[PDB]
Each structure stands twice: as C-alpha cells, then as structure tokens.
Amino acid sequence: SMEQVAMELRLTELTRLLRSVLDQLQDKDPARIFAQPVSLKEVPDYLDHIKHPMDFATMRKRLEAQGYKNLHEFEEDFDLIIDNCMKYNARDTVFYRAAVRLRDQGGVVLRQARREVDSIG
Template structure:
C-alpha cells in the first residue's frame, strides 16, 4: 500500500507523530493548564497543542493536503515522500508562536521551537 492509497486521517496522524518526536518533554502535548499560566488567554487568543491537533484530525476537521509541503525520506527504503497540507501547518505554527509569545526567550519552550 502506498502513501497515495492511505486515508487523509492516517497521513495526518503520521505527520503529527513525526512533528511531535521533537517534543520529548511533551511541552506541547496538551492544552495549557490555566491554573499554572496566569493571564494566558489575555496574551494568546487562539491556543493550540498537539492534543487539539490530534482531536481535529480524529474529527475530520482537516480536509486536504494542499499548499504546505514537507519532504521526508524514509530511512528503511530511501523513499522520498512529499506531504502537502495547510490547516495542520497553520495549527503547528500557531502552537509554536503561542509558546514563544508567552514564555521568555530563555525558557525551554524556545529551545524546542
């Protein structure tokens, strides 16, 4: 079975798994705990995290793979795969941007991004 035969939801889950590997401390795994981060919603108008992205994938809220390209080479057979998506890209960049806007430049959140 090739990537072209896979359902969109499966492709997006693979992409999210790939991106989340760079977050071993799970800083972006779930929504921010508002009891821990004061005034978060005053600074961040549209929160985002990998858990929310996964929920949106599960609910079918991402509908296409157009506009954004991610090239990945699979090590086991050196197959080059290009992924195109836009809504997932927007949410991933939103998640990282939110973290950078709310945390000091010296924080571990800036190191992940």
C-alpha cells in the same frame, strides 16, 4: 452518491497521512512541552496573551474527527503551537528553545508531507 464516497475516501487517506505526520512532529518534542493545552488553572492570564491556544492533543482531536480538509489547515495549527510559545515565553527559556527546535525539526517532515499530498493528490 458515489462521488461523496470517493471524496470521503480521500479525506480518510489524508487523515491517515496527517496522523503519521502528527506522530513524527510529536516525536520532535520528547519533553512533552506541547502535548497538552496550557493549563488556565496554572497560567490564569494565558488568554490575555494568546488568543488562539493550540497543542498536540487538541490537534489530535480535530484530526480524528477528520477536521483537517487539507495540509494547510494542519500546518496552521502546528504553527500556532510554535508561535504562541515564542510569544509567551522569553528567548532564554526552556519553553522557547523547545519551540525553536520543534520548528526546525518539523520543517523536514512537513516538506516531504507537502510533496506526498500533491503526489498522491
């Protein structure tokens, strides 16, 4: 149908906007602490601590499969990145501190993204 196509064009444009949002959030992580999945070879107990691991490469795979239906789903995954880190790592660590800074800096980007998603529909 023509409606299914219209729908698919919206999803494609949402994917376009989320790609730009993901790029902006990932620039707030210049140390690349959140770039890839925590290695289960190097942290063999990780899944005993963290039940839903997340990282920027995993988000990008979902993104490029047009797997985010709305901004809320995308934000859920960004929040997992931050919240997993803040639980696994203690307050006095470079990892925890990197998450705090990512959360704080990403807030600005996500504030305007929400406005853009509502605005453009």
